[PDB]
């Protein structure tokens, strides 16, 4: 569902975009991995009371068969299904996916 997929942007630009102080906790985007070619990344804003704003990066791996997973426990047939699942369930992530990242 497009909006949350920022394609080939870098960890550093995703962090520029996510560290925007206006963004609520759980604001996210999906991008391609720089380090692991053929893999994706789920980038999500978070907050620590003492330290403030920070970004968690989760590698989305792709099986040869076609599926996607952050943890092999929960596999998905598409990235849109992975985003819809973690919007409702944190299930291992730092926080549930709330906002789509701006611009």
């Amino acid at each position: 569902a497009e909006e949350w997929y920022f394609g080939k942007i870098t960890r550093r630009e995703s962090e520029r975009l996510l560290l925007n102080p206006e963004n609520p906790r759980g604001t996210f985007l999906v991008r391609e991995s720089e380090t692991t070619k053929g893999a994706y990344c789920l980038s999500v804003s978070d907050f620590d009371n003492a330290k403030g704003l920070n970004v968690k990066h989760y590698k989305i791996r792709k099986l040869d068969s076609g599926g996607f997973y952050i943890t092999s426990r929960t596999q998905f047939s598409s990235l849109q299904q992975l985003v819809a699942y973690y919007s409702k369930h944190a299930d291992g992530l730092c926080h549930r996916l709330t906002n789509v990242c701006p611009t």
């Binding site: 968690k56 291992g92 992530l93």
Partner: peptide
């Protein structure tokens, strides 16, 4: 990247 599960 973080460790999960």
């Amino acid at each position: 990247y973080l460790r999960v599960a």
